């Protein structure tokens, strides 16, 4: 594909009176998951979730295990620090999410890096696009930001994001080439569903595509139907491909006013579909 991403996503949830927080981390290359760690699991190891990552040797699995476990421990500490910062009790359950990773272009060069936290679903602190400073969302996050400035955390993360992260993504793309580099275009079709004597539904389908990024839209007389289109979230088929549909309610006999438009990276050119009974 024209660009690629490696992202790790972690979720820590406190369990007051039930032991230490649950910590789950997952790694993705683009829309393909390749590792997981779950503090509930018996192995206490980073575990493979894509075939091509099993090409990595024992050193990898030991090192990655050590790193994700250090992260889980620091985020348990961070949940406790947040309680102090927000004057919250030890009785309530709270969530801390982290996302980090990097985007590289098809030429193999670094494009963008990420390192950001949310607390109870709200932005807390995020590394800015130039990788030199922080967006801190509220009073508590300014305290963290001051600490991270003093310790030069942005430089540490910049070095990781432009170095290790990029190098890791390139390697995975190499080992997982046969599947990671595919741009499988959607298979498309349209269905028609009478609602009454006055109205019918036209539904435009996109099936079997990868990566997940897609644009599916309805036009009427060449005009976007933004505020009248039912559009479901892009969804996994379970076999490595994605699905989506868009539907409009059309007055009887007016089907030929409507066109469905499909953009996807695997398509030679954008598609335009018309109802053809």
């Amino acid at each position: 594909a024209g660009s690629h991403s490696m992202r790790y996503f972690s979720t820590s949830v406190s369990r007051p009176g039930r032991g230490e927080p649950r910590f789950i981390a997952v790694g993705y290359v683009d829309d393909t998951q390749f590792v997981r760690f779950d503090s509930d699991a018996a192995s206490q190891r980073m575990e493979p979730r894509a075939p091509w990552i099993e090409q990595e040797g024992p050193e990898y699995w030991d090192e990655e295990t050590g790193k994700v476990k250090a992260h889980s421990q620091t985020d348990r500490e961070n949940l406790r620090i947040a309680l102090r910062y927000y004057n919250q009790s030890e009785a309530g359950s709270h969530t801390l999410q982290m996302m980090f990773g990097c985007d590289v272009g098809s030429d193999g060069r670094f494009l963008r890096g990420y390192h950001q936290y949310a607390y109870d679903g709200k932005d807390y602190i995020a590394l800015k696009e130039d990788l030199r400073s922080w967006t801190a969302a509220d009073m508590a996050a300014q305290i963290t930001k001051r600490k991270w400035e003093a310790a030069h955390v942005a430089e540490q993360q910049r070095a990781y994001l432009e170095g290790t992260c990029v190098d890791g993504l390139r390697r995975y793309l190499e080992n997982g080439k046969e599947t990671l580099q595919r741009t499988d275009p959607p298979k498309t079709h349209m269905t028609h569903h009478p609602i009454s004597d006055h109205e019918a539904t036209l539904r435009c389908w996109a099936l079997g595509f990868y990566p997940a990024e897609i644009t599916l839209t309805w036009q009427r007389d060449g005009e976007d139907q933004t505020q009248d289109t039912e559009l479901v979230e892009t969804r996994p088929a379970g076999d490595g491909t994605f699905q989506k549909w868009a539907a409009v309610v059309v007055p009887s006999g007016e089907e030929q006013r409507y066109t469905c438009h499909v953009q996807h990276e695997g398509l030679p050119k954008p598609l335009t579909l018309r109802w053809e009974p």
């Binding site: 490696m6 994700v68 992260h71």
Partner: peptide
């Protein structure tokens, strides 16, 4: 390749 985080 996993990164690392700091304390709040």
């Amino acid at each position: 390749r996993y990164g690392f985080v700091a304390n709040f």
